[PDB]
Amino acid sequence: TEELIQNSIGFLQKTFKALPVSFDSIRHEPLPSSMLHASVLNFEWEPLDRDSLIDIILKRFIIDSMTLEKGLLNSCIGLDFVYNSRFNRSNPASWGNTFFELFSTIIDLLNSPSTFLKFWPYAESRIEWFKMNTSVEPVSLGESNLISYKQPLYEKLRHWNDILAKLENNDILNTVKHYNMKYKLENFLSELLPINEESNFNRSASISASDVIFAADYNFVFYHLIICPIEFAFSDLEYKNDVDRSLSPLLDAILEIEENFYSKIKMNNRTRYSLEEALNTEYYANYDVMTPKLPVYMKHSNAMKMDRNEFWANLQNIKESDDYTLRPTIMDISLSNTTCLYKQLTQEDDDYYRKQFILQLCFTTNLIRNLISSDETRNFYKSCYLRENPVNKKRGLNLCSYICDNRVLKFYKIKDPDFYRVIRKLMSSDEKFTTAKIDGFKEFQNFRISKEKIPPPAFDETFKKFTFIKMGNKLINNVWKIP
Amino acid sequence: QKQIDQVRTKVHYSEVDTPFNKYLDILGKVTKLTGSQNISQLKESAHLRFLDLQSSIDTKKVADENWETCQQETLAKLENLKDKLPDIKSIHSKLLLRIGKLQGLYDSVQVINREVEGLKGPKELESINASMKSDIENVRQEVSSYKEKW
Amino acid sequence: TYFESLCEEEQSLQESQTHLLNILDILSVLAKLPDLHRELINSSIRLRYDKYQTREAQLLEDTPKSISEYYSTFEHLNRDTLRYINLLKRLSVDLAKQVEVSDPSVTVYEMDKWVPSEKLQGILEQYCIRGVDAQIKNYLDQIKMARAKFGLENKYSLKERLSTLTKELNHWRKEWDDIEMLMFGDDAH
């Protein structure tokens, strides 16, 4: 009996073309109300086990319709039907499977990242439906009824990992829509699962992957120190010196430019303050208030206030529109050019490229000191590497204290605290999570959700009445009781 | 070390692929029973599991196709990059002149500040002189009043 | 290839289904055979064999100068936009802002809303080219003259009058005060 299936498909495709809902009015905000004429929600349709039969019907239907707005819209109505028809189901608790299945297959057809981003807000709005693995009843907000090694996800998770893995390899054939799609997919999966799931938190630390005289050194210290921190910690007293030989002249060559940059502004403020206190009678400059702020004539003029607006609009549409979908990111240093790099670092005006570097140093140099100083950490890492694949201290701590504590902090702490502080706050905030990952994120387990209703409180409005011993105590009052 | 890769190749080819397996089950069961009315029931599960499996393959035939084309378009897009340079160079030119103009402004302000210092009060010397001329009339008036009343 | 291998797999599936149905028919009549038994066996072997090939086939397949001048300028852009943004605010030059407020009916000046010299406003905005610089060159001398006129009027015109005019006022509020105080001060007594 394939006849029955085909004619059921014609039936559904008939009735679904009558519901008056548009794509925008079905995906983003809503979920379609129970306007379905419930006698269809009772599985007693016109052309006639029962469940899986309905399943293969719906699946066959969706596959046909996708081969645009009619397709996507029709499918979305499909899923919403599946949700709205829980109870009229033999073994209702078994509605989860037939749901997830019908979703994944849709993800498959989707012949672009553009159609994907076009379709995704639908999935964004209905996350609460993906939870409730088999619980027919809605779940309390902030709780996930779902486990990563069992029936619903047991293969879905593997597949959706293969999509990302494939999407990451073609490193050069990615347009900004790709990098903007992998984001939404990942961010999606990081929410179905709780915060400590053996899968969300990266359970095992898995570190990612004359100008020529200048670029040579920069390149050197990059590939030898930053990208591999462990291969610098547990090395000989020579490699640890080989890197040392390259680092220092570079670092000096940058902390020479930074002082010029900061030493221009100091002048262009001190002179102005001196003029102000000179001309006026009784005004005081209140030094040490550097606090950049733009001048008055550019704040008040509206003409100048508009040119910048139209300019940013222009560059915005040029950078955003198509034909320009292979853009380098902002702020990305290009190493292999070796002639622009020197120019990107040795500028006196823009500071934003000499800061990323120092951020990188102050990031790894934290971990090194943490390793050599604390046994528990390097114990943990040793355990990780081995489960993957079955005086020196003094020098390391010296070149660790030389940079993040002797030339950097003693520089920015005096030059500009508004950037001096953020470094210390991040370096602090890192150890928190490091120790948190040494443990199995047990802290994020104690999180409790109070579930109880509360009515408005009581507000007394009544004062306190009096008594009949008017004068106060009885004794004094008896006196006025005399005639 | 033979053991390590010996298991690594094992994990490298793991598969789930449920519906296929589901078909193999109903396939072999008939054989096992064959070596020697409810069978109509099996007939039901015969068709169903046959359709599903089939449908699955269809998607894998479609998806692999689509992806392929998406790598060719973005490939050809990377070729004709002659047309795209002139415009971006125009924008880059404009932004190269704005900095120039602004820089000239920050020069003019500089010379103004450097010349005010060479100096007292443009409208101060206005209200002061006005006050100086406004009252001498009054003094002449009152002195004429005392010369009168005498 | 992978696609082709899929096609062949589907072919084999279609090969076996018909034999299956064909046997279940005979069982349906029962409530000859060994042939179909053998057939279904062989076909099933063929399919199951036919998958592994598509698995391995899958897993294998996973692993002209204008371009290089397209990224270069497109990077210069991202390098100058930053210098521009820093050049607006953090590297700015500001004006002197001395106060010359008139209208003596106010005591605090708040030192912020200074909004200089609305004549100067148009000249500065005019930048957004030597003409404007020359117009500054003239503006300065203009102010230096206007300021210099009255700074000498007050010293050489009005001081001279105010001095002598206020020196010959006491001379008839004093002696008149005597001719009015002496007689009428003792006359009553």
Residue numbers in the entry:
A (entry chain A): 4 to 51, 60 to 78, 89 to 230, 251 to 431, 443 to 535
B (entry chain D): 5 to 40, 59 to 141, 197 to 227
C (entry chain B): 8 to 38, 53 to 84, 97 to 161, 167 to 227
Provide the authors' own sentences about this structure as they appear in the paper.
The evolutionarily conserved TRanscript-EXport (TREX) complex plays central roles during mRNP (messenger ribonucleoprotein) maturation and export from the nucleus to the cytoplasm. In yeast, TREX is composed of the THO sub-complex (Tho2, Hpr1, Tex1, Mft1, and Thp2), the DEAD box ATPase Sub2, and Yra1. The THO complex is an integrated structural and functional unit that regulates the activity of Sub2. Tho2, the largest subunit spanning the entire length of the elongated THO, plays a critical role in THO assembly.
Here we present a 3.7 Å cryo-EM structure of the yeast THO•Sub2 complex to reveal the molecular details of the THO complex assembly and the THO–Sub2 interactions. For cryo-EM sample preparation, the THO*•Sub2 complex was subjected to cross-linking with glutaraldehyde to obtain a more homogeneous sample. For obtaining the best quality map for model building, the THO*•Sub2 protomer was extracted from the two rigid copies (1A and 2A) within the tetramer and refined to an overall resolution at 3.7 Å. The largest THO subunit, Tho2, contains a ‘head’, a ‘neck’, and an α-solenoid ‘trunk’. Tho2 ‘trunk’ folds into an alpha solenoid structure, which binds the Tex1 β-propeller at its center and stabilizes a semi-open Sub2 ATPase at its C-terminal end. An extended region at Hpr1 C-terminal region forms a ‘belt’ lining the Tho2 ‘trunk’. Tho2 ‘head’ domain binds to a four helix bundle, formed by two pairs of anti-parallel helices contributed by Mft1 and Thp2, respectively. Sub2-C makes contacts with two pairs of Tho2 helices (residues 625–695).
